Design a protein around this nucleic acid. Structure first.
Ligand SMILES: [Mg+2]
Ligand SMILES: [Mg+2]
Ligand SMILES: [Mg+2]
Ligand SMILES: [Mg+2]
Ligand SMILES: [Mg+2]
Ligand SMILES: [Mg+2]
Ligand SMILES: [Mg+2]
Ligand SMILES: [Mg+2]
Ligand SMILES: [Mg+2]
Ligand SMILES: [Mg+2]
Ligand SMILES: [Mg+2]
Ligand SMILES: [Mg+2]
Ligand SMILES: [Mg+2]
Ligand SMILES: [Mg+2]
Ligand SMILES: [Mg+2]
Ligand SMILES: [Mg+2]
Ligand SMILES: [Mg+2]
Ligand SMILES: [Mg+2]
Ligand SMILES: [Mg+2]
Ligand SMILES: [Mg+2]
Ligand SMILES: [Mg+2]
Ligand SMILES: [Mg+2]
Ligand SMILES: [Mg+2]
Ligand SMILES: [Mg+2]
Ligand SMILES: [Mg+2]
Ligand SMILES: [Mg+2]
Ligand SMILES: [Mg+2]
Ligand SMILES: [Mg+2]
Ligand SMILES: [Mg+2]
Ligand SMILES: [Mg+2]
Ligand SMILES: [Mg+2]
Ligand SMILES: [Mg+2]
Ligand SMILES: [Mg+2]
Ligand SMILES: [Mg+2]
Ligand SMILES: [Mg+2]
Ligand SMILES: [Mg+2]
Lengths: 136, 63, 386
RNA sequence: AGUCAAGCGUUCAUAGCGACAUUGCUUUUUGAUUCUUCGAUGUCGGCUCUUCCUAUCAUACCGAAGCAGAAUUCGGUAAGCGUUGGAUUGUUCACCCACUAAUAGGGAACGUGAGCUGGGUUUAGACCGUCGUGAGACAGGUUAGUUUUACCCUACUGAUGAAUGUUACCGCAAUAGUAAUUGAACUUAGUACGAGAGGAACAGUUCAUUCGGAUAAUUGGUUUUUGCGGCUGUCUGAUCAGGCAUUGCCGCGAAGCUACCAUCCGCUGGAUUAUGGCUGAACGCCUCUAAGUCAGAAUCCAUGCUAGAACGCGGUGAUUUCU
RNA sequence: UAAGGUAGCCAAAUGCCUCGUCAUCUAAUUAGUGACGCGCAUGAAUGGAUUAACGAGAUUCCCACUGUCCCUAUCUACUAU
RNA sequence: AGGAAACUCUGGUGGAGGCUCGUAGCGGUUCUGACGUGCAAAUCGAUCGUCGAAUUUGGGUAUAGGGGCGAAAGACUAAUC
């Protein structure tokens, strides 16, 4: 996350290390995102930088439009599929890993998001919360 | 606090118990335990599992 | 040459040596600082870890995003039968530290406490404190002058107490005996309080109250001899490692030509005495009370014991302390609670806590029901029920 | 790393630099040498793991600036704490991608092979190029090529234990160790400052990074609970109930163990360093300093935490008769 | 000079400089592939160039798959005791 | 069946090959696994190559040391080359 954060995020269980491939939820013409970095991640020997829901990552478009491929761009994780605990203790998880493509400040490249998004990402990013249909 | 109902077995889910599962069609399922969760992800039908509330309703047991 | 990539040190050196504890009851190494203004009160208490459960409370944190919203928290229950005061002792302050000079016991000692001075109680004449009891039954002669000696000297007073082990489902029959410091008034007031409380009981609410941050002192659960990988958290070696891979590769350089003390090695894991601080008391529950597990929001009369009892412990028919989180030690272990050595504001030790709901489902499995009445109402009648 | 200061820096030697010269330090370079080792000290790199140094990259507190703010640069006390993930390369080194508060430099027989690996070099097989009449040569390139032993002593990690009248309980605390770390968001505040562009900080709040100590209520994992159920083949004449299939296989699976894959917790007092000062002479003035003294750092010592001297100690209970 | 390397091929297992230059492959490639050739020192039965099929041969990439790894945990038998 | 003819096409039959998958067999790729004062002066386990022949193999017989034999490794010639 970092710059465009609107408040804090309680710790979500990390489920997306680098090298992971998630789906592209928005209509920016990309199909999948390939995670190469996690913003705000710490430094430990041999530990992969792992991303959770709501975190801003650096990703490349492995499959999609050639205007988007072969370059690094910021993305935002909106669906995790690794079970995490909320403070009301419900363990929840989606059925797929999914993110959207955004600018470094948080404004989305696309305009609409398919599928649900996590509210722990919606509250952190309002532009994701704007184009989100259903927020769970 | 709310006591939710199991989306597979109709059991009562107390706070901090069981799991939740959001499917790609934005539908929310709730499981009291890994038994019902694994049966759900095995795609079993609750009307054929003899201990489910749906089964007992369908067979008029305790009805 | 230098280590190629920096990495933090595995393990903590202030918790050395990782040996078995001397006794099964952890020692209170430090008590809260005294002040000669407050009434005579204890500084600690003894209980037995009965197990864990969950609560639901409405969080009051003005600035959190879950302010005035319900959260579920893991608590642990300490079964605390009311302790019994048998004896006090005073300590003078020498240039070599504190030193006990006297010990004044109560007249009548129960069997459950005088079993502590025996290894083979079943074959014994039970002669223990029998001449000290004959030292009693005069006017006061062989007792009152030692009490006045503690008044004249002994600028720190500790009270000998012992648990009531027969009130718990444990099969021990031999109570635990300990010293608890007094932190009120003058030395004369302390020893007068003790003399009045001889052969008498002290309840846990006379020392503790709700929303108080306490320290839990206990001996952790034993795990025996353990390798370095789990004992210290070192990295597992790669798969094609001859002579095993749950090891530390380099245990030191050529020079100094010795294995260092700071090298992580295999040995005993667990059964170390630990002190975990800043644990908030959520409920000071009374055993002389039904609906211990009930709240003002729940209002269904159920005690704190789960369905089928606590696993490996039993019932909580006595008083108990529900304290937030994990404490060292396993179930059935003697646990010494202690008041905080300092006053912590933090906007978290000052949060008043009111519970909404307490979990009483069975911990022997994935329990669906909180009460047998609820279970029977949901399931209807059965074949055993006619 | 200094000393000097011709000049650069609009102006100005010294904010920052600094020529021509000159004095040193180091042993992480490569040399030089041949003292030890050729009746063998296992030899490159990586992995792993600990400690040490400071010539400090970040963090704490400060001083200086051609320091308005922001950003940056120089320097001091400081090694307490941390200093990453990857593409290529056997590499050390290197060069890029990206995160980060930062991605500082080194030593420990160029740390570490009875710790690993064997990619490389460095036996024997083989190929190419050049050289050689030839056998063959090549710090030229390529491919394939056995990595042995601890049960001994010490060291370290744990575990007992004789003797201190016996035995039991409760204690004290010499000594030794010690730990927490860093960032973001809101607010301060679009405020101070600045012509504008831009654009802070203290306090406070909520979270988070790295680490550590526990714990198993919940979630997840594990299944010889061979606990229940199901399935294949065969055998017990069939049925019921079972045997075997190196735990036959599959689903669920309590208990236990366990995970930043789960949850909880991780203290406050003093003395100081740098530095800034007070009073105040020396030197009738002036001066943080000479006497005296104040505040002050992630520093040190305590509080706290962990062991408890098995030749450190205290209090207390009972102390044997027809061995 | 006896003849001066032709046809072809190439930083090739053969190119010192060299991690050669360009393109592609990747977020990033001293690797790989396709090109270029004044080639230290390619080259024609010292056989040259190419080649379907075959290969426990060497090398790169892609899909699938996974405890190889993030980051370890648990279980069984036989040891060790 | 087609075609003017040359001959082409379709469906069967047949059962060829130093073909192929894969046993017994023969061999010995990788784990650089186990063991490594071993069960063993070369083994064990799994993973593998090949498996109708340029195959595997018994017995008999021939070649003998600067000699033999060698689908050629300076390999083998009684744990000796
Ligand atoms: Mg690594
Ligand atoms: Mg090193
Ligand atoms: Mg270093
Ligand atoms: Mg090996
Ligand atoms: Mg349980
Ligand atoms: Mg020499
Ligand atoms: Mg030698
Ligand atoms: Mg020698
Ligand atoms: Mg020798
Ligand atoms: Mg040696
Ligand atoms: Mg210094
Ligand atoms: Mg050296
Ligand atoms: Mg060694
Ligand atoms: Mg090699
Ligand atoms: Mg060779
Ligand atoms: Mg020649
Ligand atoms: Mg050579
Ligand atoms: Mg000390
Ligand atoms: Mg742990
Ligand atoms: Mg489970
Ligand atoms: Mg379990
Ligand atoms: Mg003055
Ligand atoms: Mg030519
Ligand atoms: Mg060429
Ligand atoms: Mg590669
Ligand atoms: Mg090429
Ligand atoms: Mg040639
Ligand atoms: Mg081959
Ligand atoms: Mg064949
Ligand atoms: Mg074949
Ligand atoms: Mg075979
Ligand atoms: Mg073999
Ligand atoms: Mg081997
Ligand atoms: Mg061995
Ligand atoms: Mg040869
Ligand atoms: Mg031979």
């Amino acid at each position: 996350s970092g710059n465009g954060a609107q408040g804090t995020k309680f710790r979500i269980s990390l489920g997306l290390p680098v090298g992971a491939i998630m789906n592209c939820a928005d209509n920016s013409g990309a199909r999948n995102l390939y995670i190469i970095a996690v913003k705000g991640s710490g430094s430990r020997l041999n530990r992969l930088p792992a991303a959770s829901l709501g975190d801003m990552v650096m990703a490349t478009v492995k499959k999609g439009k050639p205007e988007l491929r072969k370059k690094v761009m910021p993305a935002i994780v909106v669906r995790q599929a690794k079970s995490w605990r909320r403070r009301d203790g419900v363990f929840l998880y989606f059925e797929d890993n999914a993110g959207v493509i955004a600018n470094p400040k948080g404004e989305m490249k696309g305009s609409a998001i398919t599928g649900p998004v996590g509210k722990e990402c919606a509250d952190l990013w309002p532009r994701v919360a704007s184009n989100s249909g259903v927020v769970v | 606090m709310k006591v939710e109902i199991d989306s597979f077995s109709g059991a009562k889910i107390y706070p901090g118990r069981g799991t939740l599962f959001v499917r790609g069609d934005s539908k929310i399922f709730r499981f009291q335990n890994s038994k019902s969760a694994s049966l759900f992800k095995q795609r079993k039908n609750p009307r054929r599992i003899a201990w489910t509330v749906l089964f007992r309703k369908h067979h008029k047991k305790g009805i | 040459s230098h280590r190629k990539y920096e990495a933090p040190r595995h393990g903590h050196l202030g918790f050395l040596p990782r040996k078995r504890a001397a006794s099964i009851r952890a020692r209170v190494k430090a008590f809260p600082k005294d002040d000669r203004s407050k009434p005579v009160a204890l500084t600690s208490f003894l209980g037995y870890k009965a197990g864990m459960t969950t609560i639901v409370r409405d969080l009051d944190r003005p600035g959190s995003k879950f302010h005035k919203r319900e959260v579920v928290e893991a608590v642990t229950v300490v079964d605390t039968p009311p302790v019994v005061v048998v004896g006090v002792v005073g300590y003078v302050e020498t240039p070599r530290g504190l030193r006990s000079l006297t010990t004044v016991w109560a007249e009548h000692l129960s069997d459950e406490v005088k079993r502590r001075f025996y290894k083979n109680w079943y074959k014994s004449k039970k002669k223990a404190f029998t001449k000290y009891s004959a030292k009693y039954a005069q006017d006061g002669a062989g007792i009152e002058r030692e009490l006045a000696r503690i008044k004249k000297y002994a600028s720190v007073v500790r009270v000998l107490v012992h648990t009531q082990i027969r009130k718990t489902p444990l099969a021990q029959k031999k109570a635990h005996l300990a010293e608890i410091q007094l932190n009120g008034g003058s030395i004369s007031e302390k020893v007068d309080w003790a003399r009045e409380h001889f052969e008498k009981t002290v309840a846990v609410d006379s020392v503790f109250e709700q929303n108080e941050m306490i320290d839990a002192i206990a001996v952790t659960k034993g795990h025996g001899f353990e390798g370095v990988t789990h004992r210290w958290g070192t990295k597992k070696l790669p798969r094609k490692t001859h002579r095993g891979l749950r090891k530390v590769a380099c245990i030191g350089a050529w020079h100094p030509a010795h294995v260092m003390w700071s090298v992580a090695r295999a040995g005993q894991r667990g059964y170390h005495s630990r002190t975990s601080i800043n644990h908030k008391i959520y409920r000071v529950g009374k055993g002389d009370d039904e609906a211990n597990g009930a709240t003002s929001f729940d209002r269904t009369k159920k005690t704190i014991t789960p369905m089928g009892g606590f696993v490996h412990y039993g019932e909580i028919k006595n008083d108990f302390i529900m304290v937030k989180g994990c404490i060292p030690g396993n179930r059935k272990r003697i646990v010494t609670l202690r008041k905080s050595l300092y006053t912590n504001t933090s906007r978290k030790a000052l949060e008043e806590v009111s519970l909404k709901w307490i979990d009483t489902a069975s911990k022997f499995g994935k329990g669906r029901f909180q009460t047998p009445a609820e279970k029977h109402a949901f399931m209807g009648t059965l074949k055993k029920d006619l």
